[PDB]
C-alpha cells in the first residue's frame, strides 16, 4: 500500500510523477487521505511543513474527484507568480490525461470559456469573482471541489478575507441544498495553533503533522559561537577566511561542501551590497588575486528589456547573484531558475522571497531579526526557513539567524515562538461585500435567511451588527427596499459582476459618471486615468522630478489634468515648502503618466531614468493596473454604459504587455511579451492571422536581430533556443486560428 | 447576324436573357458594337432613347471585356435606387457564370474585398472613392473597363462633376502609360447635341441614334382639343364621363383599352388629391353608385413599419395609387413593383419618378408645364415621357401635356426644344478636389505634368487658373512645398482616402478637433452630431415644435447642445420674432436629434407625429447620414485618431438600418431591415452566429406575430412568402458563417 502505483492514478500521471522524481509517498499523506470520509465527499483541512510536500494530498484528492465525478474544480493561490508556476506544473501534469487547466491571474483570462475549462488555477481575487459568476446563473453544479491554499492567510491579510468569504459562501450553498457533499473544500496551512476551530468551521476532519523529509535545526549565533534553540551550543563558530558579523564565512562553509546558501537581506539597498561583497570575497579566496552554463545564464540577461544590471555584472559570473522586489519581473525567474539547477550558490534576497516560489537551499541565513524597522513576524518566519533541506539530496537543513547586542532577546523569540491564531477580519468594509455577494446573486432573499448566513461565517463558528449594515446598503442605493425582501439595483448588480469592493464603487460610480461632462480622446491619459487602481506604496514619489515633467508635458496632456482635478497651480509647488483626496488624485495622475509611457513602449531603462521608479515597481504596477481596467470595463458593461466600455475594452491588454494598438492581435501569442512582437511587427507581419502562415526560416533571422544555445526566454518554460521559440511562435499562432472559430 | 445566339455569349447568359424577354437583336446596337475598333479596347460614348434599351450595349461590351481579358470592372449609376436595381439585375444575370458583382451604394459596403469583386455597381460618389483607392496602392491593373451612365449629367449637377473628374483621371492614367487600350470607358446618354465633343474628349468614336422600338407622339391640349407638336390637330378631345382640365377624362380613355397611365403631378399635395379623385370617380363611373392580387398588394402595405397611409387606403383597392418623394422608401418599391406587373392602373407622381427606375405606361400625362414654381427643364422632359410605350406590348406611346391660358407658349417650348449642351463645371470648389485626387495619389508629382493633366480635362478639350489653385492647397496645409515638387500631408492624405471634398474637410478638421477636447458618452448625441452631413433641404423645420422638444429633452442631452455651440438662450426664440454658421449648427443639431430616435427604434409613425418630418424625408436622411459616418470614420483613421474612430466605428451600420447595438450582428443578414430582427432578437436569438443554426420551423411562428401568400417584403426580390423568407433568413445567415472565415 506504501507506493503510488497501488493508489488509483492514471498511467500518464504516474509516469509524469516519475519524471518529477516523486516516487515515494509519505506515510502522513497516506494516513491522512485514508483517514475518515474525506474521499467520498467530506471536506478536509490539514497542515504540514512546506518542504514536507503539502501539494501531494491536494493533487491526489482533486485527481480522484475529477476521475470519479465529472465536475469542474478550483485552485485558490495567493500570488500571481506562484499561481503561474502552479498552473504550468498542473498543465504539464494533466496534458495527456485530459483535464485541461487554465488560470485567472488578474489580467490574463483563458481564451476558452469556463464550461470547457476544468481546473481554474487562479488567485483569490479572481476565484471569488468566478464563484460569484457561477452562483449568478444557477450553474454551480459544475463546481465539485474547491482547493484553497494557506488558510492561515484568511485572517489579517489584504486578500485572505476574500478566501474566507468564498469558503463561507460555499458552505452556505452546501447547507442550503440539504433542505454526500455537493462541493468539497480542501486546503493546506502552516503550523496553525487553532486549526481545529477552522476545520470544524467547515465541518472538516482535522489532521496536523510536523513530519519533515529532512531534519531541520535552527541556530542563533552569539559573537563567535552558535547557539541552538533550547539554550544549547551545538557548534563552535570559527571563521576560515575573511577580508563580529562574519556574514561571508557561513556561505564559505557550505560553498566548500558543494551546496547553496540563501542570504536573506532586510532592505532594497542591503541586497546589492551583500551579494557584491561575497563575489568580491570570491576574487581572492578562490583565485589568489559550471562556467560554461553560468555564462549562458549571464547571456540570458543580456537581451532582456532592461539588459543586465550593473550590480549584477560584477557578481553573476562567479555563482553569486541577488533577487529582491526591485528587480525585473523577468530577471526574477531566471535568477530563481538557475538556483533550482544549482548554477548560483548564494542569493541576497528580501522578505518577499519567503512567500514566493520554492527555492531549496541547504543553509538559510537571516541577517537581522528586524526587517524593515519592525520585528520579524512569526508567520513569515515559518516559511522563511522552511526551504532548508532538499528532498533526497541534503541530509540536514539549517538556519543561522544573526543577532547582535540586545536584539538577541527579540531575535530568540521567533525560535521558541508559535504562529499566531487566525482571525476573521469581520462596521467592517470586509463584510459589506460578504452579504452583497449573496443578496444580489439571488441565493438568499429573506432577511431571516440572511441572518442564518451570518451563522455560517467564520465569526459565528469562532464562538449583532450584521442586520444594521444592510441598512448601510439600503442608504447607498445598492439594495432597493420592498415588502423584508431585498432586491438588487443597477449599481448593486454591477459591483458583484465586476468583483469590486463596495467601498471603492461609491467613488468610481461618481468618478466614471464625471467622465461624461468632459472627455478627451487624442491621448490615452484620461482613459488611463480611469484604470489606475490607487497609489498604495508602489513607489516613493519625487516631487521635483514631476515638476520638470509637468512643464514638458504636451498641451494635449495638460488638458486631462485640469479635467480630473489636478491643478497646474498646485503640482509639486506647496509640497516642497511643506487634502487626503487630492494626493489620491495627483498620485492617480502620476500612475496614469507612467502607464502612458508603458503603453507607448518606452524602454524600461529610459523610463527608470526618467520616472525615478525602478523596474521592480513598474512591472508590479502595470500588472495591478491591468486588472483594474478589466474590472472597470465589466463594471461599465453591467451599468448600461456601452460607450465607456468601447474605449476601455482594449486597455486591459495594452497595460498587461506594454504594447500599442497595432500589436494587440500579435500579442495574443503568449511568447511575444513586449519586444518579440515589435520587431516581428516591423517584419511585415501585422496580424496573428497571417502569422500562423509565416515561413519558419523567415522568423529566425528577424528575431535574432534587435538585441538590447538557449538564449531566448519565454515565461513558464525557463530558457529556450532561438530556433525552437520561433518554431513555437508559429505553432502557437497556428492553434489559435481554428480553436477560437 | 441580327440574333443574340450568333453573338458570342455564355449559353446560360443567353437563356437568362430569353427569360427576360429580350431575344430580338436590334440594328443600331449591332452596328454600334461592330463599328470601328470598340471591341478591341477603344472606349465609346453613344446616345440612345431610354426605352430603346441603352443598357444592353454596355452589357455586351462588359461581357466581351470580361471574357476576353480577366479584369475587374466598374459600373457607375445615377442614384442609390437605380444602382441597387441594376446590381440586382446584374447579379441575377451573372449568378452561374462566375462574375460575382456587388455594389457600393453609399452606406452599404461589400462583405468581400474588391480583389474577389468583379463588377462594382456603385454610384458616382463611391465609384470615385473606389478608383482613388485603386490608384493609391498601384493596383490599377485590375481596372480594365469602366461603365459610366448619363454623361449628360456630368454638366450642371451636384455629383456629375465627380464623374467628369473620374473620367479625366482615367484618361490621364491611360495616356501616361503610353510613354490596344489600358482601360475601356463606355457610357450612354440622352439626345445630347454636343456628344461629338464629349466623345472626342475621351478620344471615343461617336454614334447617336433616335431609333425607338415603338413610336412616341407628343401632344398639347387646347380647350377641348389636342394639338400635335408641329401645329397639327391629330385628334378632337371629347370627354366621356366626368363629375377645361378634364384630367380624369384622358385616363378614362386608356382604362377602357386595358392599359395603364402615369399622371405626373407638381407637388406632394397635388399627388394625394389627384389620385384620390380618380379613385373617387372610379367609384361612380364603374359601380353605378385583379381584385385578388390587388388585395395582396394592399396586404403587403399593412405590416410595413409605417403601416398603410390613410390617403392610400381610399384609393389602392381600385387600381389607383400614388407615389411621390414623401412616401416611404419601402412603399415606393411595392407601388412601383405592382405597376410593372399591371396590378395598378393610375399613378400620381412627382418629378422624382422621371430619373428613377423604368415605369412603362401607354399614356403619360403631365399636369402643368410649371413644376415647383419654375419652368420644366428640357433634360428631365426628354426622360420624362421616355417610358411611353411598352416594348412588344403597346403599338403606340403618347404624352399629353396639359397647358392653360398663356402657359401654352411656355409649354410648347418643351416640345420643340433640344437638350442643352453639357458643360464642365470647372476658383472652383469642384476642381480643388480634381488635382488633389491626383497629386496626393502619387500618380503626378512634377508641376509641369500637373499642368499637362489640366490638358486632359473636359474644359481643355472643350476649346490659366489651374496653377493658382495649388497655391490655395499650399495655404491650407493640404500640400507641403518642397523643391517644384508637391508631396501630400497628413490632412491631404486623409481627405483623398475618405473621399470628402476639400471644402468640407476644413470645417470637419476643426469640428472633429473641438470634440477632441471635450466629449460626452452616456448618450449617442455627440457622436451623432459629428455624422450628420448637413441640413440641405431635407425638410422645412418647425421652430415652435422644436422649442417644446427643447424643454422635454433630458438634462444629459442638454449638455451636448451647449458643447457644440447650440444655445439654450437662443433656440426657437429669436426666429419666432424675426448667423449663417449658427443655423448650420441648429439644423445640424436637429438632424442629430431625429437620428437619435432613428437609432432608438422609435416607430416612424410616432416619429412623423413628433418630428413633423414625413417618412419620405426620414429614410432619405438616414441613408445620407449613414454615408457620412462611414466617411468621418475613415477620415479619422488616416489622421491618426484611433479613439474617435472607435466611437464612430459602429455608427454607420446603426444609421443605415435604424437599429441598436444589440441587433448590430443580427442585421448583417440583408433580410432583417428594422423589425424582422427586433422580434427575432426577443425570440432568444442575439447573434448571427447561432442564428445560422436556428430551427427552421421555430422562426416561422415568431415572424408571423408583431404585425403593425407573399405578404412579407424583402428589398431586391419584391414580395416573398413567410415560409420562404424565414427559410432564406437562416440560409443567408448560414453562408455568412464560413465565407467570412
Curated annotation (Swiss-Prot), chains A, B:
One MF annotation (Gene Ontology) recorded for this entry: ATP binding
Residue ranges, annotated region (Helicase activity): 35-454
Domain Helicase ATP-binding stretches: 35-210
Subcellular location(s) per record: Nucleus; Chromosome
Domain Helicase C-terminal: from-to ranges: 244-454
Disulfide cross-links: none
The keyword Zinc-finger appears for this protein: no
Residues the entry annotates as binding ATP: 29, 48-55
Chief place of localization: nucleus
Keywords, alphabetical: Acetylation, ATP-binding, Chromosome, DNA damage, DNA repair, DNA-directed DNA polymerase, Helicase, Hydrolase, Multifunctional enzyme, Nucleotide-binding, Nucleotidyltransferase, Nucleus, Phosphoprotein, Transferase
Post-translation changes: Phosphorylated by PLK1; promoting interaction with TOPBP1 and recruitment to DNA damage sites.
Keyword Heme on entry: no
GO terms under cellular component: cytosol; Golgi apparatus; mitochondrial nucleoid; nucleoplasm; nucleus; site of DNA damage; site of double-strand break
Impact reported for residue 54 to M: Abolished ATPase activity
Record-level GO BP terms: base-excision repair; DNA damage response; DNA repair; double-strand break repair; double-strand break repair via alternative nonhomologous end joining; error-prone translesion synthesis; negative regulation of double-strand break repair via homologous recombination; protein homooligomerization
Tissue expr: Highly expressed in testis.
Region (Interaction with RAD51): 709-741
Protein family according to the UniProt entry: Belongs to the DNA polymerase type-A family.
Quaternary structure (record): Homomultimer; forms homodimers and homotetramers. Interacts with RAD51. Interacts with ORC2 and ORC4. Interacts with RHNO1; interaction takes place during mitosis and promotes POLQ recruitment to DNA damage sites. Interacts (when phosphorylated) with TOPBP1 (via BRCT domains 7 and 8); promoting POLQ recruitment to DNA damage sites.
Disease linked to the protein: Breast cancer: A common malignancy originating from breast epithelial tissue. Breast neoplasms can be distinguished by their histologic pattern. Invasive ductal carcinoma is by far the most common type. Breast cancer is etiologically and genetically heterogeneous. Important genetic factors have been indicated by familial occurrence and bilateral involvement. Mutations at more than one locus can be involved in different families or even in the same case.
Notes concerning its domains: The loop 2 region is involved in the binding of the 2 ends of resected double-strand breaks and homomultimerization.
Function per UniProt: Low-fidelity DNA polymerase with a helicase activity that promotes microhomology-mediated end-joining (MMEJ), an alternative non-homologous end-joining (NHEJ) machinery required to repair double-strand breaks in DNA during mitosis. MMEJ is an error-prone repair pathway that produces deletions of sequences from the strand being repaired and promotes genomic rearrangements, such as telomere fusions, some of them leading to cellular transformation. MMEJ is required during mitosis to repair persistent double-strand breaks that originate in S-phase.
Listed name of the protein: DNA polymerase theta
Source organism (scientific name): Homo sapiens (Human)
Gene responsible for this protein: POLQ
Residues of the full protein shown: 68 to 891 of 2590
